[PDB]
mmCIF file of C-alpha atoms and ligand atoms in Angstrom:
data_model
loop_
_atom_site.group_PDB
_atom_site.id
_atom_site.type_symbol
_atom_site.label_atom_id
_atom_site.label_comp_id
_atom_site.label_asym_id
_atom_site.label_seq_id
_atom_site.Cartn_x
_atom_site.Cartn_y
_atom_site.Cartn_z
ATOM 1 C CA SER A 1 8.851 95.230 0.324
ATOM 2 C CA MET A 2 8.478 92.566 -2.280
ATOM 3 C CA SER A 3 7.189 89.479 -2.797
ATOM 4 C CA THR A 4 6.640 86.655 -0.463
ATOM 5 C CA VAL A 5 8.756 83.585 -2.417
ATOM 6 C CA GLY A 6 10.939 86.798 -3.282
ATOM 7 C CA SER A 7 12.395 87.117 0.698
ATOM 8 C CA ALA A 8 11.559 83.398 1.649
ATOM 9 C CA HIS A 9 14.074 82.428 -0.921
ATOM 10 C CA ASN A 10 16.386 85.996 -1.208
ATOM 11 C CA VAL A 11 16.249 86.373 -4.689
ATOM 12 C CA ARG A 12 18.828 88.246 -6.362
ATOM 13 C CA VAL A 13 18.464 89.158 -9.937
ATOM 14 C CA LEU A 14 21.494 90.239 -12.006
ATOM 15 C CA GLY A 15 22.272 91.332 -14.587
ATOM 16 C CA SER A 16 20.280 91.855 -18.280
ATOM 17 C CA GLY A 17 19.802 90.295 -21.487
ATOM 18 C CA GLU A 18 17.449 88.109 -23.584
ATOM 19 C CA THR A 19 17.664 84.393 -21.694
ATOM 20 C CA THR A 20 17.637 84.571 -18.244
ATOM 21 C CA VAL A 21 19.859 81.802 -16.351
ATOM 22 C CA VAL A 22 19.318 80.557 -13.535
ATOM 23 C CA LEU A 23 21.369 79.427 -10.904
ATOM 24 C CA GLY A 24 20.353 77.432 -8.242
ATOM 25 C CA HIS A 25 23.430 75.116 -5.393
ATOM 26 C CA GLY A 26 22.871 72.068 -3.737
ATOM 27 C CA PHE A 27 22.888 70.500 0.016
ATOM 28 C CA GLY A 28 24.912 72.174 2.536
ATOM 29 C CA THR A 29 25.223 75.752 0.721
ATOM 30 C CA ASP A 30 23.785 78.828 -1.040
ATOM 31 C CA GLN A 31 23.454 81.351 -3.680
ATOM 32 C CA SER A 32 26.974 82.225 -2.414
ATOM 33 C CA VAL A 33 28.067 78.663 -3.342
ATOM 34 C CA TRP A 34 28.146 80.742 -7.485
ATOM 35 C CA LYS A 35 29.893 84.540 -6.349
ATOM 36 C CA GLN A 36 32.777 83.055 -8.884
ATOM 37 C CA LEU A 37 31.069 81.474 -11.700
ATOM 38 C CA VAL A 38 28.502 84.839 -11.871
ATOM 39 C CA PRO A 39 30.492 87.883 -13.458
ATOM 40 C CA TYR A 40 31.452 85.137 -15.783
ATOM 41 C CA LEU A 41 27.886 85.596 -17.376
ATOM 42 C CA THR A 42 26.064 89.018 -15.943
ATOM 43 C CA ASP A 43 27.425 90.159 -19.377
ATOM 44 C CA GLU A 44 25.586 88.822 -21.085
ATOM 45 C CA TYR A 45 22.539 87.053 -19.580
ATOM 46 C CA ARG A 46 20.371 88.289 -16.619
ATOM 47 C CA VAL A 47 21.415 85.267 -13.908
ATOM 48 C CA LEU A 48 18.872 84.619 -11.138
ATOM 49 C CA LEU A 49 19.786 83.344 -7.990
ATOM 50 C CA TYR A 50 18.244 82.112 -5.427
ATOM 51 C CA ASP A 51 18.975 79.378 -2.067
ATOM 52 C CA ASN A 52 17.151 76.452 -1.228
ATOM 53 C CA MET A 53 14.454 76.912 1.442
ATOM 54 C CA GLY A 54 16.145 74.568 4.377
ATOM 55 C CA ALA A 55 19.147 76.581 3.483
ATOM 56 C CA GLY A 56 20.345 78.596 6.217
ATOM 57 C CA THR A 57 20.104 81.715 5.164
ATOM 58 C CA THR A 58 15.875 81.134 5.148
ATOM 59 C CA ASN A 59 13.798 81.172 7.267
ATOM 60 C CA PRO A 60 13.514 78.460 10.123
ATOM 61 C CA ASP A 61 9.314 78.534 10.561
ATOM 62 C CA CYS A 62 8.920 78.905 6.547
ATOM 63 C CA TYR A 63 11.293 75.365 6.510
ATOM 64 C CA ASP A 64 7.628 72.638 6.549
ATOM 65 C CA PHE A 65 8.533 69.215 7.373
ATOM 66 C CA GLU A 66 5.210 67.356 5.616
ATOM 67 C CA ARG A 67 6.094 69.408 2.426
ATOM 68 C CA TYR A 68 9.878 69.263 2.314
ATOM 69 C CA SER A 69 9.917 65.123 3.023
ATOM 70 C CA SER A 70 9.908 64.817 -0.376
ATOM 71 C CA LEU A 71 11.404 66.910 -3.313
ATOM 72 C CA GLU A 72 8.209 68.278 -4.817
ATOM 73 C CA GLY A 73 7.655 70.652 -2.822
ATOM 74 C CA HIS A 74 12.132 72.059 -3.857
ATOM 75 C CA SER A 75 10.239 71.834 -7.460
ATOM 76 C CA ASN A 76 6.954 74.150 -6.647
ATOM 77 C CA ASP A 77 9.240 75.812 -4.463
ATOM 78 C CA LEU A 78 10.471 76.266 -7.906
ATOM 79 C CA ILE A 79 8.165 76.613 -10.273
ATOM 80 C CA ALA A 80 6.690 79.386 -8.075
ATOM 81 C CA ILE A 81 9.780 81.724 -7.439
ATOM 82 C CA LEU A 82 10.150 81.729 -11.297
ATOM 83 C CA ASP A 83 6.240 82.169 -11.958
ATOM 84 C CA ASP A 84 6.631 85.304 -9.087
ATOM 85 C CA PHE A 85 10.047 86.391 -10.940
ATOM 86 C CA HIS A 86 8.500 86.905 -14.787
ATOM 87 C CA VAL A 87 11.245 83.910 -16.487
ATOM 88 C CA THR A 88 10.339 81.661 -18.969
ATOM 89 C CA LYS A 89 13.227 79.315 -22.188
ATOM 90 C CA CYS A 90 15.334 79.948 -18.729
ATOM 91 C CA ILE A 91 18.750 78.403 -19.305
ATOM 92 C CA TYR A 92 18.678 76.850 -15.310
ATOM 93 C CA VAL A 93 22.469 75.415 -13.812
ATOM 94 C CA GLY A 94 21.784 74.031 -10.705
ATOM 95 C CA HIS A 95 24.162 71.548 -8.573
ATOM 96 C CA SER A 96 22.258 68.154 -7.497
ATOM 97 C CA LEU A 97 18.910 69.006 -5.521
ATOM 98 C CA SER A 98 18.112 71.864 -6.933
ATOM 99 C CA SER A 99 18.587 70.310 -10.615
ATOM 100 C CA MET A 100 16.868 67.426 -9.933
ATOM 101 C CA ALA A 101 14.134 69.316 -9.130
ATOM 102 C CA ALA A 102 14.534 71.708 -12.418
ATOM 103 C CA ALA A 103 14.263 68.590 -13.888
ATOM 104 C CA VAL A 104 10.745 67.375 -12.632
ATOM 105 C CA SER A 105 10.097 70.891 -12.989
ATOM 106 C CA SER A 106 10.332 70.858 -16.494
ATOM 107 C CA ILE A 107 7.640 67.474 -16.860
ATOM 108 C CA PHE A 108 4.761 69.248 -16.130
ATOM 109 C CA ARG A 109 6.282 73.287 -16.501
ATOM 110 C CA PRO A 110 8.301 72.810 -19.689
ATOM 111 C CA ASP A 111 7.961 76.492 -21.262
ATOM 112 C CA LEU A 112 10.134 77.452 -17.817
ATOM 113 C CA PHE A 113 12.742 75.477 -19.228
ATOM 114 C CA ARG A 114 15.039 76.004 -22.668
ATOM 115 C CA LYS A 115 17.842 74.040 -20.844
ATOM 116 C CA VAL A 116 19.205 71.922 -17.396
ATOM 117 C CA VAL A 117 22.407 71.128 -16.579
ATOM 118 C CA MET A 118 22.747 69.959 -13.498
ATOM 119 C CA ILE A 119 26.351 69.298 -11.648
ATOM 120 C CA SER A 120 27.127 66.188 -9.575
ATOM 121 C CA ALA A 121 22.979 64.664 -9.615
ATOM 122 C CA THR A 122 21.872 61.108 -8.675
ATOM 123 C CA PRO A 123 18.334 60.031 -8.902
ATOM 124 C CA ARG A 124 19.162 57.767 -6.335
ATOM 125 C CA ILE A 125 21.949 56.979 -4.129
ATOM 126 C CA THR A 126 21.160 53.145 -3.171
ATOM 127 C CA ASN A 127 20.757 50.411 -5.023
ATOM 128 C CA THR A 128 19.702 47.684 -6.193
ATOM 129 C CA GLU A 129 19.156 44.281 -6.994
ATOM 130 C CA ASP A 130 19.431 46.352 -10.845
ATOM 131 C CA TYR A 131 20.748 49.577 -10.490
ATOM 132 C CA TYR A 132 24.143 51.350 -8.605
ATOM 133 C CA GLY A 133 23.735 53.643 -6.863
ATOM 134 C CA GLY A 134 26.817 53.458 -5.043
ATOM 135 C CA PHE A 135 25.805 52.801 -1.282
ATOM 136 C CA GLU A 136 24.512 49.525 -1.135
ATOM 137 C CA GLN A 137 21.257 49.750 1.492
ATOM 138 C CA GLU A 138 22.188 48.774 4.534
ATOM 139 C CA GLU A 139 25.149 51.301 4.198
ATOM 140 C CA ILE A 140 22.767 54.688 3.683
ATOM 141 C CA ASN A 141 20.397 53.643 7.314
ATOM 142 C CA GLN A 142 23.561 52.875 8.983
ATOM 143 C CA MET A 143 24.770 55.743 7.263
ATOM 144 C CA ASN A 144 20.818 57.962 8.574
ATOM 145 C CA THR A 145 21.109 56.158 11.965
ATOM 146 C CA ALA A 146 24.377 57.832 12.986
ATOM 147 C CA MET A 147 23.333 60.707 12.179
ATOM 148 C CA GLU A 148 20.471 61.248 13.816
ATOM 149 C CA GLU A 149 22.641 59.440 16.946
ATOM 150 C CA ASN A 150 25.087 62.725 16.346
ATOM 151 C CA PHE A 151 24.248 64.914 13.573
ATOM 152 C CA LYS A 152 27.149 67.778 14.480
ATOM 153 C CA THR A 153 30.029 64.689 14.045
ATOM 154 C CA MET A 154 28.350 63.439 11.269
ATOM 155 C CA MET A 155 28.366 66.815 9.091
ATOM 156 C CA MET A 156 32.290 67.179 10.838
ATOM 157 C CA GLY A 157 33.154 64.636 8.746
ATOM 158 C CA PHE A 158 30.753 64.165 5.741
ATOM 159 C CA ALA A 159 32.086 68.131 4.561
ATOM 160 C CA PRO A 160 35.581 67.672 3.382
ATOM 161 C CA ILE A 161 35.025 63.585 3.076
ATOM 162 C CA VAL A 162 32.216 65.165 0.168
ATOM 163 C CA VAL A 163 34.533 67.565 -0.929
ATOM 164 C CA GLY A 164 37.695 66.350 -1.273
ATOM 165 C CA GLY A 165 41.062 67.223 0.107
ATOM 166 C CA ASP A 166 43.425 68.809 3.039
ATOM 167 C CA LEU A 167 41.326 69.934 5.822
ATOM 168 C CA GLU A 168 42.302 73.562 5.629
ATOM 169 C CA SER A 169 41.601 74.542 2.050
ATOM 170 C CA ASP A 170 39.175 77.294 1.498
ATOM 171 C CA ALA A 171 36.297 75.218 -0.394
ATOM 172 C CA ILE A 172 36.532 72.764 2.805
ATOM 173 C CA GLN A 173 36.308 76.050 4.659
ATOM 174 C CA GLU A 174 33.965 77.720 2.949
ATOM 175 C CA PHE A 175 31.291 74.468 2.583
ATOM 176 C CA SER A 176 31.563 73.508 6.013
ATOM 177 C CA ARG A 177 30.516 77.486 7.103
ATOM 178 C CA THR A 178 27.258 77.347 5.843
ATOM 179 C CA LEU A 179 26.183 73.798 5.974
ATOM 180 C CA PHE A 180 26.609 73.886 10.289
ATOM 181 C CA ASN A 181 25.196 77.329 9.800
ATOM 182 C CA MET A 182 21.318 74.975 8.771
ATOM 183 C CA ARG A 183 19.405 73.969 12.057
ATOM 184 C CA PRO A 184 19.777 70.612 12.963
ATOM 185 C CA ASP A 185 16.180 69.101 12.429
ATOM 186 C CA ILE A 186 16.293 70.491 9.088
ATOM 187 C CA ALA A 187 18.803 69.912 7.535
ATOM 188 C CA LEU A 188 18.130 65.628 9.301
ATOM 189 C CA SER A 189 15.442 66.516 7.625
ATOM 190 C CA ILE A 190 16.601 66.806 4.087
ATOM 191 C CA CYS A 191 19.043 63.931 4.595
ATOM 192 C CA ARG A 192 16.492 61.778 5.506
ATOM 193 C CA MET A 193 14.819 63.744 2.065
ATOM 194 C CA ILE A 194 17.966 62.942 -0.245
ATOM 195 C CA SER A 195 18.240 60.001 1.080
ATOM 196 C CA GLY A 196 14.978 57.527 0.537
ATOM 197 C CA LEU A 197 14.602 60.176 -2.813
ATOM 198 C CA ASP A 198 14.498 57.997 -6.569
ATOM 199 C CA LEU A 199 13.982 59.475 -9.360
ATOM 200 C CA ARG A 200 14.084 56.722 -11.979
ATOM 201 C CA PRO A 201 10.690 57.041 -12.683
ATOM 202 C CA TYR A 202 10.728 60.243 -13.686
ATOM 203 C CA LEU A 203 13.646 60.617 -16.365
ATOM 204 C CA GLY A 204 11.497 59.599 -18.785
ATOM 205 C CA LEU A 205 9.328 62.195 -18.781
ATOM 206 C CA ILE A 206 11.827 64.723 -18.869
ATOM 207 C CA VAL A 207 12.611 65.680 -22.411
ATOM 208 C CA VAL A 208 14.326 69.015 -21.821
ATOM 209 C CA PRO A 209 18.079 68.906 -23.279
ATOM 210 C CA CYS A 210 19.753 68.364 -20.329
ATOM 211 C CA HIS A 211 23.807 68.628 -19.185
ATOM 212 C CA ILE A 212 24.603 66.035 -16.856
ATOM 213 C CA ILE A 213 28.477 66.901 -15.178
ATOM 214 C CA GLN A 214 29.901 66.145 -12.483
ATOM 215 C CA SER A 215 33.887 64.830 -11.405
ATOM 216 C CA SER A 216 35.183 61.490 -12.736
ATOM 217 C CA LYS A 217 35.189 60.002 -8.727
ATOM 218 C CA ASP A 218 32.393 61.714 -6.397
ATOM 219 C CA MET A 219 32.044 60.255 -3.458
ATOM 220 C CA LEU A 220 28.871 60.490 -4.102
ATOM 221 C CA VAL A 221 27.663 59.915 -7.417
ATOM 222 C CA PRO A 222 29.601 56.770 -9.343
ATOM 223 C CA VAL A 223 30.819 57.738 -12.569
ATOM 224 C CA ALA A 224 27.505 54.788 -13.733
ATOM 225 C CA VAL A 225 25.107 57.519 -11.787
ATOM 226 C CA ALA A 226 26.127 60.346 -14.718
ATOM 227 C CA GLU A 227 25.452 57.174 -17.519
ATOM 228 C CA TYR A 228 22.323 56.358 -16.357
ATOM 229 C CA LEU A 229 20.724 59.936 -16.657
ATOM 230 C CA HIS A 230 22.479 59.828 -20.575
ATOM 231 C CA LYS A 231 20.428 56.415 -20.948
ATOM 232 C CA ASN A 232 16.907 57.105 -19.572
ATOM 233 C CA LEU A 233 16.733 60.947 -20.280
ATOM 234 C CA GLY A 234 13.430 61.817 -22.212
ATOM 235 C CA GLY A 235 14.798 63.657 -24.627
ATOM 236 C CA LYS A 236 18.604 64.970 -25.468
ATOM 237 C CA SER A 237 21.095 64.609 -23.266
ATOM 238 C CA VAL A 238 25.547 64.860 -23.075
ATOM 239 C CA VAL A 239 28.075 63.678 -20.876
ATOM 240 C CA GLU A 240 31.311 65.072 -18.937
ATOM 241 C CA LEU A 241 33.248 64.373 -16.904
ATOM 242 C CA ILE A 242 35.492 67.026 -14.580
ATOM 243 C CA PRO A 243 38.832 65.307 -14.190
ATOM 244 C CA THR A 244 39.508 65.867 -10.149
ATOM 245 C CA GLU A 245 37.584 64.982 -6.771
ATOM 246 C CA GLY A 246 35.073 66.083 -4.986
ATOM 247 C CA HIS A 247 30.478 66.378 -4.938
ATOM 248 C CA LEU A 248 31.135 70.299 -5.345
ATOM 249 C CA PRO A 249 33.907 71.417 -7.512
ATOM 250 C CA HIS A 250 31.897 74.509 -9.080
ATOM 251 C CA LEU A 251 33.130 75.323 -5.459
ATOM 252 C CA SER A 252 36.469 72.918 -5.029
ATOM 253 C CA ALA A 253 38.021 73.252 -9.246
ATOM 254 C CA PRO A 254 36.867 76.511 -10.879
ATOM 255 C CA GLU A 255 39.619 76.709 -12.348
ATOM 256 C CA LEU A 256 37.907 73.071 -13.621
ATOM 257 C CA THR A 257 34.358 73.883 -13.233
ATOM 258 C CA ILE A 258 33.740 77.378 -14.900
ATOM 259 C CA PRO A 259 35.443 76.858 -18.021
ATOM 260 C CA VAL A 260 33.034 73.752 -18.341
ATOM 261 C CA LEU A 261 30.188 75.533 -17.457
ATOM 262 C CA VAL A 262 30.388 78.326 -20.185
ATOM 263 C CA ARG A 263 30.962 76.314 -22.633
ATOM 264 C CA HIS A 264 28.105 74.583 -22.073
ATOM 265 C CA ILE A 265 25.696 76.878 -21.026
ATOM 266 C CA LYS A 266 26.079 79.175 -24.046
ATOM 267 C CA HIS A 267 27.057 76.085 -26.815
ATOM 268 C CA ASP A 268 24.161 73.833 -27.231
ATOM 269 C CA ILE A 269 23.337 69.722 -28.230
ATOM 270 C CA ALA A 270 22.856 69.155 -31.709
HETATM 271 MG MG1 MG B 301 20.274 64.803 -6.995
#
């Protein structure tokens, strides 16, 4: 059979070309979240897709609770994936968590990345005296408390609120399907990690060009966070807001988001 890293992350390679586009997904989804975007890319790029460890499509026994208590475990998985599949200078396009993992990875291994397109990314969701992440700490702890109380109940509100729109919409139904296929203890572990994550000290060390993409109204990512990322990244960057509501605009608003991503994949920051 194929490599252990490839089978553990369900790595899939489509198309062909000189440049490889790598697609990463966020919490509660898997690589199937990119099914609408991939046809726009396979004729000119090689496209690699992979699942984060912990996704409902991955083996629950491979989720080392110690290893994935910080982003480093996901960052080292990504490096191993691109190594095992011999990718260099890829165009990385990732939603939320995965784009941050790629950005940090580029600090130590800049050979693997030509640029990073971050969608709805944030270095820290909790406010401090000098930083606005969107949530006071005594809101996040109350959140973390409620997720340990009734996790499935919190996720049943989480999914439509975070995606935005009608309970009946296709995006909310699809996001719920993959979110509820996760194992509760694994998902809770991931939310704990995101909840305490603070990537602010890393931003100055990231020097690969970053394209900061997010919805103008994201319940988890204030527009101030995109501006904070732009300001504190160590290399070139650009910010473009998608005029829409939702944390997963690639899933909920493809008609706006897919044209934005293709233009940022193709064109470079001068
Ligand atoms: Mg993030």
